[PDB]
């Protein structure tokens, strides 16, 4: 799973090489950034329920036809899967924050994303809109480098979905 630390190890290993000062300075960058990252993760974890609820409701505000009979935002099961999915994204964002890299998102959401969404008729636009709403809300919960960290991973997702 991709983190700064697995990445620098992969680098040294691809060259049959002991880790040197090149890779250790890199690793220090991961460790120095951890405090800001963990502060972001903590804020997203503790506001998770309301961040998910609001995001799901913003999807239905943006695409109102979804909540009509026959549509994919209609019924308890469709709506429960939405909340679950948006909870997944937020969970994997917190993981990436704590991990020091995009690996959790890459491995659990991004690999297979379009194949899966195509087969189950899931529009990336719904998830992009959910994530933009979460981004708006996180902007009042965090500032400074914790905000920069959170935004990086939220934007990463939005891009993966585009």
């Amino acid at each position: 799973m991709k983190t700064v630390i697995t990445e620098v190890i992969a680098s040294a290993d691809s060259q049959g090489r002991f880790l040197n000062n090149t890779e250790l300075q890199a690793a220090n960058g991961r460790f120095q950034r951890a405090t800001a990252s963990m502060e972001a993760a903590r804020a997203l974890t503790s506001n998770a329920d309301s961040l998910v609820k609001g995001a799901v409701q913003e999807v239905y505000n943006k695409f109102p036809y979804l909540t009509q009979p026959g549509q994919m935002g209609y019924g308890d099961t469709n709506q429960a899967k939405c909340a679950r999915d948006i909870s997944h994204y937020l969970r994997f964002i917190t993981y990436s924050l704590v991990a020091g890299g995009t690996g959790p998102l890459d491995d659990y959401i991004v690999a297979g994303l379009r194949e899966v969404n195509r087969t189950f008729n899931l529009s990336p636009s719904w998830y992009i809109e959910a994530l933009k709403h979460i981004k708006g809300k996180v902007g009042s919960q965090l500032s400074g480098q914790p905000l920069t960290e959170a935004n990086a991973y939220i934007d990463y997702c939005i891009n993966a979905l585009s």
């Binding site: 799973m1 620098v8 190890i9 290993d13 250790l24 460790f31 963990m38 704590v98 959790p104």
Partner: protein, 172 residues
Amino acid sequence: MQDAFTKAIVAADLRGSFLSEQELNQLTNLVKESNKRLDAVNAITGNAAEIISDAAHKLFAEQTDLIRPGGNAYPNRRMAACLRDMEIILRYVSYALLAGDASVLEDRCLNGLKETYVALGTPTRSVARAVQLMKETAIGYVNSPSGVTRGDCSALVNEAATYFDKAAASIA
């Protein structure tokens, strides 16, 4: 490959959960101890050739059978293969120590290695001894750096030992 953070995430995902307070607090302490961890990795890297060479000298003084005709560290070709193996194992142990996780050592080095040695007729306990000897010399360097801020690295030393001991037990 996993590291200490990634390992925790994998486990929290199997529970369908955000990381717990408990998981976060052990990751927070790893971050807190990370400079010492970097010094410990740097001790092995900066003294790698020396670590391999002292361990090799000691092995062949203990087990002179290996450097006689009929022995598995004779002729030059076998000695070179042996020394290369010591370097490989020391390299993967040190990767594990940066990672805070043994998975890279298990996956890319130890997996199937005893079986390979048994097929070759390489004495697996002599390889284990070589790993043991490298642990002792490597730990000596971790404990004796030049001009590093003084403090207590016993936990990191214990952790380094586990990776070496892992390798030795997997091979022997």
